[PDB]
Design a protein around this ligand. Structure first.
Ligand SMILES: O=c1[nH]c2ccc(S(=O)(=O)c3ccccc3)cc2c(=O)n1O
Ligand SMILES: [Mn+2]
Ligand SMILES: [Mn+2]
Length: 136
């Protein structure tokens, strides 16, 4: 990939990603739902909210084709990726794994939306990852 796309990629699968963690137990979940009806959730241990957001993006990169749209509610995760591309043109291992996957893509669009603002795909993945982690 040459850059993050300036707008969504026509014809590419869209992954709504999210993570949830609990500070008392360090238990969490990460996952995605896609516009093509795919979904995945994984359970995590010794994790944090920010780590789960990175894990969700890693899953989306791993499971997507060469062109992908990713919608996250994490400014932290968005910033990690934007900063790396910049320097190219905390959570060190996870970040390296994400960059490893990112560089294999042909095109990537990555957009931020606010959490808990009624945004469809984002609310769907939030329900999936927060169950058993965050109290309703
Ligand atoms: O990235 C984030 N940031 C959040 C910030 C606040 C809340 S909250 O629990 O305080 C909340 C819940 C419901 C409505 C408003 C705020 C939840 C989240 C969340 O689930 N994800 O994924
Ligand atoms: Mn989130
Ligand atoms: Mn959430």
């Amino acid at each position: 990939m040459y850059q993050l796309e300036k707008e969504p990629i026509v014809g590419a699968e869209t992954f709504y990603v999210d993570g949830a963690a609990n500070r008392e137990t360090k238990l969490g979940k990460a996952g995605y739902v896609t516009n093509r009806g795919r979904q995945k959730v994984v359970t995590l241990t010794d994790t944090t909210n920010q780590k789960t957001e990175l894990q969700a993006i890693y899953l989306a990169l791993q499971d997507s084709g060469l062109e992908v749209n990713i919608v996250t509610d994490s400014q932290y995760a968005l910033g990690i990726i934007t900063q790396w591309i910049h320097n190219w043109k905390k959570n060190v291992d996870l970040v390296n794994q994400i960059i490893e996957q990112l560089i294999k893509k042909e095109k990537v669009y990555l957009a931020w939306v606010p959490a808990h603002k009624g945004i469809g795909g984002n609310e769907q993945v939030d329900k999936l990852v927060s169950a058993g982690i965050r109290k309703v």
